[PDB]
Each structure stands twice: as C-alpha cells, then as structure tokens.
Automatic annotation (TrEMBL), chain A:
Family: Belongs to the isopentenyl phosphate kinase family.
Binding annotation for ADP 2: 6, 9, 176, 206
UniProt-annotated binding residues for ADP 3: 9-10, 176
Main function: Catalyzes the formation of isopentenyl diphosphate (IPP), the building block of all isoprenoids.
Organism whose genome encodes this protein: Thermococcus paralvinellae
Entry keywords, A to Z: ATP-binding, Isoprene biosynthesis, Kinase, Nucleotide-binding, Transferase
Binding site for ADP 4: 9, 176
Positions bound to ADP 1: 6, 9, 176, 178, 203
Protein name: Isopentenyl phosphate kinase
Positions annotated to bind ADP 5: 9, 176, 178, 206
Catalytic activities: isopentenyl phosphate + ATP = isopentenyl diphosphate + ADP
Molecular function terms from GO: ATP binding; isopentenyl phosphate kinase activity; kinase activity
Top-level enzyme category: transferase
All residue ranges annotated as the Aspartate/glutamate/uridylate kinase domain in the record: 2-221
C-alpha cells in the first residue's frame, strides 16, 4: 500500500526549475494522499550535475582529494537547494513533504547501496509524512566518494520496503523499442524481460534497476509532464510502459 | 581521538555572524586533519521562530495537518542556516559536510532513543567534518518534537566517546551566580558537586554536561573570542573545564 515515485532529472529541471510541473505532480498526489503512502525520489537536475561533473565526483577520492572533498560538499549543498525548492512547492499544495538526506543514511559500493538506514523513513511513512529523497553525493566504501543515483536509491528502497508500485516520471511516454529520436520509434505498452535484455544488448542503468525492482514491485514508466499520467499509474490504469511484477 | 564542538545558537545568530563562524573555521584549520571534528549548531534565528510558532513541542495534537506542514517548514529553515555555516566552512578550505539530524535520529521524552551513526563514522574516517544541527525530529511518544543540539551531543558522546566536547557560549563559561550580576565568579574547574549545587538553586546544558562527563572531558568557553576554541582543543586553561569523571 506504498508507492515510490521517482521524479526524473530532465523532468523537474534541465540551475533551472519547472515549478509548474512540480505543482502538477503535487496536485496529482493530493488526490490519493493520505489514503496511500508515498516516497518521492527526485533526480539531480540542473543543480547537482553541474557541480558533480565540474568536480568529477564519480572518479573517487583520487588526485586532488582536498578539492574533491570541497566539491563533494558543494554538490550536496546544491542538491539541498533543489530539494528545498521541491519541498516548498509540495508544502504549498497542502502536502506534508519532508526532506531526507540520502547521504546521511546510505553507503555505496560499486554504485550500489550496500548499507542503509530505514527506520526514520518507516516512521515518517507511519506518521503520514511524504519523505522526499534525492540523488546525491555519497560515501563509497571502494572509492571514498561517489554519486548515488536516484535509480539505485529506488531499487534499495524497493527491495527493502517492498512498495506496491514504482512509478518513473520521464521525459518520454515510456520505454520505446528504439531510441525515440529515431523516426519509427514505437512505445512498448507492456514491458517484459525479453525485450529489456534485447534492448540492453544493443537509460541502460534504468532498465537494469527496473529488472531488479520488478522482482518486488510493479514498475511504470510514464511521461511526468502530463498531469493525469501519475494518477493513471497510481490507479493501475493503462498508461505509458508497464513492467509487471516478475512471477 | 576526536572532538565534538557545539556552536550555541547565540554565537552563530541572533541573523548570521559570519565573522564568528570564520574565526571558528580558522581555529579548526590548525588541527585538521590530524584531529577529527564533529560540529553541532543550534537554531539561532532560523529554527527557533518556526518551532515556537508551529508548537512542535506539543507533538501531533490539535490541527495535525498544520503541524506536519510546520514541522517541514522548520526543517527547511534549519537547512538554510546549515547551508550558511557549511559554505562559510568551505570557503576556508575545510570539508564540512551537512548531516541531517532528523534523518538519523528518533526521539522519546526529548532524548535520542534511536540513532544511525555509521555514516558519521565513515565521514570522520575519510577526513570529512560532519556538521549537524538542532532540528525537528520524529518522536516515538508525541509524533513530532524538537531535538535540541545538547541532546544530539549527549547521544554522540555516549556512542562515539569523543576525547572532548566543547560548548561555545555567549559568556566565558559557567559562573557562580548569573553573569548579569556584577559579583559573578567564573568557575575555572567544574566538578559534580558544584554542578549539583548549581541545579538546586541553562540547567538543561548542565544536566547534559553531567551525563557527557561520564565519557568525555567538557569545556565551556566564550565563542566570541577566536583563540578560546584552540586553547580548549589543546587542553590549555580556558573557560570552565569539567574533567572526565572517575570514581
Ligand atoms: N528505448 C528507449 N525508451 C525510452 N527512452 C530511451 C530509449 N532509448 C534511449 N532513451 C533515452 O534515454 C533517456 C533516459 O533518461 P535517464 O538517463 O534514465 O534519466 P536520469 O538522467 O534521470 O537517470 C530518455 O530521456 C530517452 O531520451
Ligand atoms: N550560571 C550561569 N552561568 C553562565 N551562564 C548563564 C548562567 N545562568 C544563565 N546563563 C545564561 O543563559 C543563557 C542561556 O543559554 P542557552 O540558550 O542555554 O545556550 P544555547 O544557545 O547553546 O542553547 C546563556 O547565554 C548564559 O549567558
Ligand atoms: C547529484 C546527482 C547527479 C545525483 C544523481 O542524479 P540522478 O538521480 O541519476 O538523475
Ligand atoms: C529546530 C530547533 C528549534 C533547534 C534547536 O536547537 P538548539 O537547542 O538551539 O541547539
């Protein structure tokens, strides 16, 4: 009875910010809160990618370690600024969004969460709060520092909290049989593991994490810039790309 | 071999005293990275108004829908002040990293009864400087509550057992009478019996200090004079000194 919604990076922003679509997402959620429990995870957007790439966080604690520590902290602060933008938008619509710093509760190894703290998340959901996490800088056991993607957060949360469904808000209507740039690109309504592996053999992080998530939850990939898509996915109606739970 | 420094809300705000934070950072730089440091700061003029307004200390009672929104608003203001302090520390070349207190702690009777400490340890190991703040917090009894900096410091003292805990205050230390009286005398060496004498006649800080002294040496110093922090870190004579309890 809990839904995890992953706000795409290109969805919420591009240091830009699309207030209108965040209001749309909040209004959509308000039609189901507080009857359903929601965890939100928002991407780095135009706030975290600048500093992460400028400081090359994914390289680890190598070379100029002092500059990399400073940039680690600056990138986290920028992500906190974006998180505040989103949280304020959600509060304005009457929804009690509450911020949870991903780097405070997660440890990384090989881009994957290998250590987590979920009790405060559980209690937040129990008191009918909407916890809002974000792709973040994170301490990595192998390379000191790394970038924890929102997809990995969602996969850890999926395998630990076993939500009812996981909804990915993307810039496209769902998963396509080819690159949507191409002219003949067709949208896959019902996704299966066969076409997922076929697509991977030729974004890929998203398909891999979705393969893992589908073990525990039903997955949706929808276009987050159209309001009714979120409600349709929450209500289980036909919308976007559906990846049913692997049985 | 690690020192916890608690920045009182009166020296960091009451508003933002950038110069005092800059002095604290310049003093800390004399020991980084040979000494491990954790920093906790209060609400000052950021979390105190919101917490007084939304009546967070009453818990989840009355109009709870407003209480949740105010809980979140207070946390966001705390994050804003935290960012001010963090950016100040970063400009001076110290890798201060923001740890969200409400993300890793759970309260009962205003005391931390649940806590996540592994990320703090990993931050200290990788020569980072964690910076926590007095915060809003989930309470197991009243739903929501205000987690003060003194309680954070007492919990971290129990768990991590720092070499010392240093309280930065508006005054030179613990006095005989109130410092507003002309004849007040500064107690340069505090013991259990002098503490107990003082309580029977701020008191929260003294109770927490009595608890902390079981694990660590405590210093009460004036945060407005730059050199006091370094005098306390090196163990020199400064302010009030509560030695670690023996038998
Ligand atoms: N078959 C496909 N179906 C859907 N999207 C695709 C496909 N092939 C390539 N893409 C592109 O990959 C992108 C995936 O975004 P992604 O990188 O997962 O977001 P984030 O940066 O938040 O992780 C989409 O914007 C889309 O343009
Ligand atoms: N016996 C005393 N010795 C020293 N200071 C005192 C005493 N009694 C009251 N005070 C004053 O009361 C004020 C309360 O400070 P407090 O708000 O507890 O610190 P913080 O800002 O860390 O919470 C202090 O600034 C201090 O000047
Ligand atoms: C700070 C940062 C780039 C986090 C990861 O972003 P995303 O969730 O992978 O879009
Ligand atoms: C959010 C809030 C009122 C924090 C209070 O912290 P502190 O007791 O001033 O250290």
């Amino acid at each position: 009875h809990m839904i995890i919604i992953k706000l795409g990076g290109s969805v919420i922003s591009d240091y830009s910010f699309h207030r209108h679509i965040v209001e749309q997402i909040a209004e959509e959620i308000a039609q189901f809160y507080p009857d359903e429990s929601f965890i939100l995870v928002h991407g780095g957007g135009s706030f975290g990618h600048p500093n992460a790439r400028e400081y090359k966080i994914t390289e680890g604690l190598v070379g100029d370690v002092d500059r990399k520590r400073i940039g680690f902290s600056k990138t986290h602060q920028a992500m906190l600024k974006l998180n505040d933008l989103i949280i304020q938008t959600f509060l304005e619509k009457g929804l009690p969004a509450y911020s949870v710093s991903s780097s405070s509760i997660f440890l990384l190894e090989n881009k994957e969460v290998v250590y987590g703290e979920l009790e405060i998340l559980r209690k937040l959901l129990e008191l009918k709060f909407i916890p809002v996490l974000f792709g973040d800088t994170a301490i990595a056991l192998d390379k000191g520092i790394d970038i924890l993607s929102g997809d990995q957060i969602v996969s850890y949360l999926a395998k630990m909290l076993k939500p009812s469904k996981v909804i990915f808000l993307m810039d496209v209507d769902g998963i396509y049989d080819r690159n949507p740039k191409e002219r003949d690109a067709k949208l896959i309504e019902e996704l299966n593991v066969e076409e997922i592996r076929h697509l991977l053999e030729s974004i890929g992080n998203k398909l891999r994490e979705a393969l893992k998530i589908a073990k525990h939850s039903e997955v949706y990939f929808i276009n987050g810039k159209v309001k009714e898509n979120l409600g349709k996915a929450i209500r289980g109606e036909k919308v976007g790309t559906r990846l049913r739970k692997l049985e």
